[PDB]
From a paper:
In Gram-negative bacteria, conjugation is mediated by a large transport apparatus—the conjugative type IV secretion system (T4SS)—produced by the donor cell and embedded in both its outer and inner membranes. The T4SS also elaborates a long extracellular filament—the conjugative pilus—that is essential for DNA transfer. Here we present a single-particle cryo-EM structure of a T4SS complex from the [name] plasmid that comprises all four sub-complexes: OMCC, stalk, arches and IMC. Three ATPases, VirB4 (also known as TrwK), VirB11 (also known as TrwD) and VirD4, power the system.
The OMCC is composed of the O-layer embedded in the outer membrane and the I-layer located underneath within the periplasm. The O-layer, which comprises full-length [name] and the C-terminal domains of VirB10 ([name]) and VirB9 ([name]), and the I-layer, composed of the N-terminal domains of these proteins (termed VirB10NTD and VirB9NTD, respectively) form tetradecameric and hexadecameric assemblies, respectively. Thus, two heterodimeric VirB10NTD–VirB9NTD complexes insert into the I-layer (diametrically opposite), whereas the C-terminal domains of these two complexes are not inserted in the O-layer. As layers of pentameric VirB2 are added, the pilus grows from the bottom, pushing the VirB5 pentamer out, passing through the arches, the I-layer (no conformational changes are needed), and finally through the O-layer channel, which is known to be flexible enough to open up7,23.
Author numbering:
A (entry chain C), G (entry chain F): 17 to 44
B (entry chain A): 177 to 331, 349 to 395
C (entry chain B), F (entry chain E): 136 to 266
D (entry chain D): 199 to 331, 349 to 395
E (entry chain n): 177 to 247
H (entry chain k): 177 to 198
The structure:
């Protein structure tokens, strides 16, 4: 009647780009 | 005389040898005992079977002088656990065995794994197997009582079941991505793999 | 001669020419453990983290939503980049009790084939053992 | 007679340190504390252990029924300047009482819930059977002996009572300061 | 004296030997401990009898340097 | 020659040039265990305590409020400064049954990268072991 | 039904600057 | 010293020999 709790699932509301600027490792 | 046996044996002295202070050799290439290594657990941990754990350092680890990064962040630590849990226990003993630096440095630290605040062993959610331990007895008793009721309405097996399944050790579940510490149990020396050089100014 | 071969191999690994970069990455969840940059070169996916950030644990998410381990290597001058050895539509980032989802919005199922046995198209891996 | 009382810490000296790790006695483990104060010599003139020195110890064996304190042995202290001495001394409370003590979990439910539940279901079944018109001892015998667990919070004050003489003659020396 | 038996045996030191860092030889021809190999199970597994399992790697496994496909 | 190198390394460690200091720190709680000064240089955080004060225990507070251990070194002429090896928005100070919260009010997520492997930008850590 | 007590949480009312004066280690 | 019997025996290392590809 009791099961192992799952890890937190992230909310899918605040979806935004990861890259605000081009990385310099890309040489750009 | 050798009399007064009880009083004479409670008066036997306890003589503890003194200690002399020493000094650490190179504190820039050294990580001493009691240093806390903060790493993030990669594998999900279930203590049914003996197994191996893995974590990655979340932060750089400096020397005792606090001037040289001896273990880089993202270093991979490998450990293992065994033996399972006993009734009333909620934490498993994990031994971390080896750490690999991203640049190829390897050191065998055989240290105890702890929680985020240094409490001994890893702990998570505990499954005590209540039903697997008591359901046989409960079911046997209830069917016995139901049969007795039906027999009356015409107008010990439960102890045996409980004796066999009462001793089932609990199982620990720890989620992946949980923060853990490694408390360094011995002195770690990095003199053979690193050296320092001054940078030419400007 | 072998030093010459080793120098050639290192030069070929470093030159890193003819590489396309995918920067279409979104994220939702706990932004405090978020990378400052994420991209992939068609073979590996790179997440870059700031100096003051803890390095989290990164997980591979399949179509049904199940997480699984993926091998990682830590690269970069200051060990600030986690490189995972796969290109995937969705990633999961976990640190403690905080989670963040990363979405590849330009996922290419085809990718580029690995005909050489190395991470670079300029080095063969050749069978020394013979036998 | 003691040799040099400026480079000496004798038995029975109290070292006041603050507990860093949170202590839970389920598994054997290692503790850590930091000295909150400078420790002087027996003459009281030279600081032999600086404040902020790190002490490493360990405990093992768990608790027995009726016990509320765990034995902790402190093994080594490291000075911020690099001095190391192996003191193998008993850890105590803030007022010198032996062992570390905190909040005790006696596992009442894990020890008696099986028996209570078995008895109550037996009685309920008997009542239902009557309304038509030992397993409890076995359960208790197996789970009655569960040792208690001690919880001690992080940041708690503790003492180390020095069990042996500590000699600092090889690592320090004194020199007079030129006046003005 | 050899008295104080209980207290004297709880004060026996635990001295753990230190460790020295080494270095891995060739990180392009190496797969180290703790590497995760992701494979797909071929056989159906039923634990009635002891038996042998079989799986196939679903992905390439690189070296610790991450530059050579070793498996 | 090695004495010359060691002298150069010590001079580079001491010179401590091009360092920015953050002094925006607030505190709430039990002020009797409070430091007299707190600041950070972008890599380490320094809490300075008075001569008559006991040195407390300092803990790392994450976003959810969970405390965790952080390594510390004791620096200063009179061992009156605790240097923690991290820069964090919130800190917890505990001594006995008294607690004090420290808040970094100018937290920089980016920080400054550690490209050299040492606490100073003037010393490389170089791989001696080769292998 | 009984759990380990938590350490005291500091009150968030008397929030004041730590630095009344510039430290001398900053050379200021 | 040989004390700390339980903790010292849980800290005994497990050293597994490496393998070479053929």
């Amino acid at each position: 009647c009791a099961s192992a709790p799952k890890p937190k699932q992230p909310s899918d509301f605040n979806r935004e780009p990861v890259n605000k600027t081009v990385p310099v490792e890309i040489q750009r | 005389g050798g009399g007064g046996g009880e009083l004479a044996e409670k008066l036997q002295p306890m003589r503890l040898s003194g200690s002399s202070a020493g000094r650490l050799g190179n504190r820039d290439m050294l990580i001493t005992q009691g240093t806390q290594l903060d790493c993030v657990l990669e594998t999900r941990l279930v203590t049914t079977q003996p197994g191996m754990t893995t974590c990655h350092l979340t932060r750089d680890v400096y020397s005792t002088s606090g001037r040289v990064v001896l273990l880089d962040r993202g270093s991979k630590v490998v450990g293992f656990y065994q033996g399972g849990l006993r009734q009333g226990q909620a934490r498993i003993f994990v031994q971390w065995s080896r750490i690999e630096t991203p640049s190829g440095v390897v050191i065998n630290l055989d240290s105890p794994g702890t929680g985020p605040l240094g409490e001994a062993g890893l702990g998570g959610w505990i499954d005590r197997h209540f039903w697997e331990r008591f359901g046989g007895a409960i079911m046997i008793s209830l069917i016995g009582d139901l049969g007795d009721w039906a027999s009356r309405q015409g107008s010990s097996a439960a102890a045996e079941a409980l004796r066999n399944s009462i001793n089932i050790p609990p199982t620990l579940y720890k989620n992946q991505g949980e923060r853990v510490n490694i408390l360094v149990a011995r002195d770690l020396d990095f003199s053979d793999v690193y050296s320092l050089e001054s940078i030419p100014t400007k | 001669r072998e030093a010459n071969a080793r120098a050639a191999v290192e030069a070929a690994f470093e030159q890193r020419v003819g590489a396309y970069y995918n920067l279409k990455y979104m994220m939702s969840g706990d932004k405090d453990i978020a990378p400052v940059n994420a991209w992939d070169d068609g073979r590996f996916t790179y997440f870059k983290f700031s100096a003051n950030a803890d390095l989290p644990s990164i997980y591979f998410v399949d179509a049904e939503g199940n997480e699984s381990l993926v091998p990682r290597t830590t690269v970069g001058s200051s060990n600030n980049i986690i490189a995972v050895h796969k290109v995937n539509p969705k990633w999961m980032i976990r640190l403690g009790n905080r989670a963040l989802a990363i979405f590849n919005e330009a996922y290419d199922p085809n990718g580029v084939p690995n005909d050489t046995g190395t991470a670079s198209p300029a080095v063969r891996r050749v069978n020394k053992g013979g036998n």
